[PDB]
Amino acid sequence: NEVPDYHEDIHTYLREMEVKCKPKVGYMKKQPDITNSMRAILVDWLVEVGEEYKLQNETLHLAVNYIDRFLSSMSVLRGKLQLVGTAAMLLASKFEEIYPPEVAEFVYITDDTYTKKQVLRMEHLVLKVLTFDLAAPTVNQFLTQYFLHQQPANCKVESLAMFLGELSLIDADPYLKYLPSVIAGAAFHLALYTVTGQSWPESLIRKTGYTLESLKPCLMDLHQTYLKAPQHAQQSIREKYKNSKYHGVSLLNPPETLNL
Amino acid sequence: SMENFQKVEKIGEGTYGVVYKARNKLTGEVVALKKIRLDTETEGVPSTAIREISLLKELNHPNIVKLLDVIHTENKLYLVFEFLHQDLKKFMDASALTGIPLPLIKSYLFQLLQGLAFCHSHRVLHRDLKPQNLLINTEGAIKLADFGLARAFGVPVRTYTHEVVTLWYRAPEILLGCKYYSTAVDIWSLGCIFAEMVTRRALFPGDSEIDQLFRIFRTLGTPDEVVWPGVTSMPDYKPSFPKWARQDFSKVVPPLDEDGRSLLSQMLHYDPNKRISAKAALAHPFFQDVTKPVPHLRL
Ligand SMILES: Nc1nc(OCC2CCCCC2)c2[nH]c(-c3cccc(S(N)(=O)=O)c3)nc2n1
């Protein structure tokens, strides 16, 4: 399977890094023309894009991070929001994917709203703004690490944790407030207990240092989001997780209870 | 933008950009510039540049080449690295007659392993270790270079790019076409480089995919599910492989003592999980006396 020599150092490093590549929390409030709503729209659209080209979730997890970061220091008009979106994704794909889609492809998927030079120039601007700091931790990196503590590793929980993290990305507030490791922390446990009833493992407390007490504020926010899933205007993410690939996990009923 | 720098000569290529030797006119710093074009095929900023830059910023270590600046021009992109005396290849080539002094090898290998464990702990796989990509100074240190092929990995690793490494230093699992490769691959390479510093000739001078694999088998023996649990249900594995018997190591590495060949052996285990880590290798008894010799030039 693997030689797991560096799990500890690696986990350590991503915890150190996730602090540094963290976007600014109330940034949308500063932004003259864009709203949390607009951003949800953007993320949702990014999600279909990922499906159409069979892209990694990791790819879009990075993409999202790149946007929040970029929009943290660069004022942008709604007219141009989608383009920041597309360049972000192209960079992500470039960094992560084995076979990233051609520049051509990306221009295609924009309603032909923007030219190619537009997209390529934006690509460059984003790199300038992020100062080439693209190697960022995401929720997925944490989950995938966390998943190793599971015996026997259970498909449904995994596909549900992945699903939940993704949901968080649609919502700026409240989720910009939480570090990826905590978003992962929450989703994992929330999945685990919807599916097997079982508990955030003692094992992970020892690795992460997180207790259920320490995760509670997040979980409260996350539960209601799962609850009101079918009323949110963003639907693509749900539809994605209905397939035989992901064991139709969006169709389950969220738990009544958490013992509050 | 470059009005500060004076090109002296081209030093080489690797075909990805070109590499010039520059001096700062103001400070007199001597640097290695790596020039990169972007208006290649209207395909944006190249992947092999994006990854190198972003990971080399994350990586600061004494045995990993220093990236000093990155200069943004509209059509070119210059990377400024620290400048070193030569690469291990042309030094072995020079030292070819005498052969490499015994403890200078031990030193270099030790340092190289310090560097690789840094990479691995920052979730970076190098993937193109070879004497051309390892630079030495005059001060007796050696640095890893050319992270053009490197990539950041996940834990556990996903399926990553197949066409990797250089063939002479390529590991079995990749030759055999496996769906998941890990840290193990870099170690294999460093293994072959260790052997090459010692014997004076490359370990597996293969001419093709199949030829490379057999060259390995003919030394280390063809493997079975004992030596390598999983080998037989791998993607490009073929039951009609010849059955070569493994051979004696003092026959393979004649100048090595018991310890060195103990070490080397573990760096070359068919099984990736079994293959020694960079970390674990650092604690190996062979490094007991490790000191820091200085090489002769006359350049
Ligand atoms: N920073 C840096 N990188 C180098 O290599 C970059 C290339 C490594 C191989 C793959 C392409 C990038 C260098 N090469 C030399 C250097 C200095 C003196 C002599 C020589 S050599 N090869 O013996 O003519 C190389 N100094 C160097 N300094």
In short:
The complex is a heterodimer of chains A (260) and B (299). By secondary structure, chain A is mostly helical. In chain A, 62% of the residues lie in helices and 0% in strands.
How would you describe what is shown here?
Chain A: Keywords: Acetylation, Cell cycle, Cell division, Cyclin, Cytoplasm, Host-virus interaction, Mitosis, Nucleus, Phosphoprotein, Ubl conjugation. Chain A: One of its GO terms (cellular component) is nucleus. Chain A: It is found in: Nucleus; Cytoplasm. Chain A: Its main location: nucleus. The complex is a heterodimer of chains A (260) and B (299). Chain A is built from 14 helices and no strands. Chain A is mainly alpha-helical and 260 residues long. Chain A folds into two domains: 9-22 and 136-260, Cyclin-like (Cyclin A, domain 1); 23-135, Cyclin-like (Cyclin A, domain 1, Orthogonal Bundle). The longest helix of chain A has 17 residues, at 36-52. Chain A starts with 6 loop residues before the first helix and ends in a 20-residue tail after the last helix. Chain B is α+β, with helices and mostly antiparallel strands and 299 residues long. Chain B folds into two domains: 2-85, Phosphorylase Kinase, domain 1 (2-Layer Sandwich); 86-296, Orthogonal Bundle (Transferase(Phosphotransferase), domain 1). Chain B has helices spanning 47-58, 88-94, 102-121, 172-175, 184-199, 209-220, 249-252, 258-267, 278-282, and strands spanning 5-12, 18-24, 30-37, 67-72, 76-82, 86-87, 124-125, 134-136, 142-144, 151-152. Chain B has a five-stranded antiparallel sheet, with helices on one face. A three-stranded antiparallel sheet of chain B has the order 6-8-9. In chain B, strands 7-10 form a two-stranded antiparallel ribbon. In chain B, strand 4 (67-72) and strand 5 (76-82) form a beta hairpin. In chain B, helix 3 runs antiparallel to helix 5. Chain A binds chain B through residues 1-7, 9-11, 13-14, 17, 56, 58, 90-91, 94-95, 98, 100, 102-103, 116, 120, 123-124, 127-128, 131-135, 140-141, 144-145, 148, and chain B through 42-45, 47, 50-51, 53-55, 57-58, 70, 72, 120-123, 152, 154-161, 180, 182-184, 272-275, 277, 279-280. The complex binds the ligand Nc1nc(OCC2CCCCC2)c2[nH]c(-c3cccc(S(N)(=O)=O)c3)nc2n1. Residues 11-12, 14, 19, 32, 65, 81-87, 90, 132-133, 135, 145-146 of chain B line the site of ligand G6T.
